[PDB]
Amino acid sequence: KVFGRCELAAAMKRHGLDNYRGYSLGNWVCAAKFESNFNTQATNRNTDGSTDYGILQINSRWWCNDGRTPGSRNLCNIPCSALLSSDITASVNCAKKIVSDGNGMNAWVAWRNRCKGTDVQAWIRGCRL
Ligand SMILES: [Cl-]
Ligand SMILES: [Cl-]
Ligand SMILES: [Cl-]
Ligand SMILES: [Cl-]
Ligand code: NA
């Protein structure tokens, strides 16, 4: 599924991301836009042989099992294919673990580079939240 911006905002809100670890919802919508283009199906291979999955581009090195990332962890206890579902529940739950890990949303390169320090409230403008 390719979410619309406010559609994704609402989904992320219902699943508990708004202000989660102090990151307002716009941070999460922003990060998703530049991670995945709001596409739950997005995958992008990394140099180290891991892959990022889903709307929030969660990495198989630490977070999900994709069966082809040797000596990785699966801290979210999920297959990485769970992260590609039109339903973003698994992605959101895993994102909550990630952002709790020490490094906050710096875990997501697109967030650090495109969202951190920006007017992320813009990403939830217009949405009925
Ligand atoms: Cl698995
Ligand atoms: Cl959803
Ligand atoms: Cl933080
Ligand atoms: Cl916001
Ligand atoms: Na893994």
Side-chain angles (χ1 to χ4, degrees):
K1 168 160 171 182
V2 181
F3 277 79
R5 179 177 58 82
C6 292
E7 186 187 13
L8 184 63
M12 283 179 159
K13 183 142 180 56
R14 84 172 179 87
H15 294 303
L17 281 186
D18 183 17
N19 307 308
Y20 187 89
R21 293 291 278 218
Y23 292 89
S24 65
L25 190 64
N27 287 284
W28 297 100
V29 173
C30 181
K33 175 72 172 181
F34 297 124
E35 284 159 356
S36 66
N37 231 333
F38 295 156
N39 186 5
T40 67
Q41 296 196 246
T43 59
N44 287 280
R45 188 81 95 145
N46 307 123
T47 50
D48 69 355
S50 68
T51 301
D52 293 340
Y53 294 84
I55 197 107
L56 286 162
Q57 288 291 277
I58 288 180
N59 185 267
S60 64
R61 173 63 56 204
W62 304 106
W63 302 107
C64 62
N65 177 57
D66 68 0
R68 61 166 201 199
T69 310
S72 68
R73 328 200 58 203
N74 178 12
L75 286 166
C76 296
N77 303 293
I78 50 171
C80 298
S81 49
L83 304 174
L84 307 168
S85 171
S86 289
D87 184 318
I88 75 169
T89 299
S91 284
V92 170
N93 284 340
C94 191
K96 286 178 174 174
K97 298 192 82 292
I98 295 163
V99 73
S100 299
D101 193 54
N103 199 34
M105 285 194 74
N106 298 292
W108 290 275
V109 61
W111 178 83
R112 293 204 311 267
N113 294 330
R114 310 193 61 187
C115 303
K116 181 178 194 188
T118 77
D119 170 32
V120 295
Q121 177 121 41
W123 292 93
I124 57 66
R125 81 201 170 266
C127 305
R128 290 136 164 168
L129 285 157

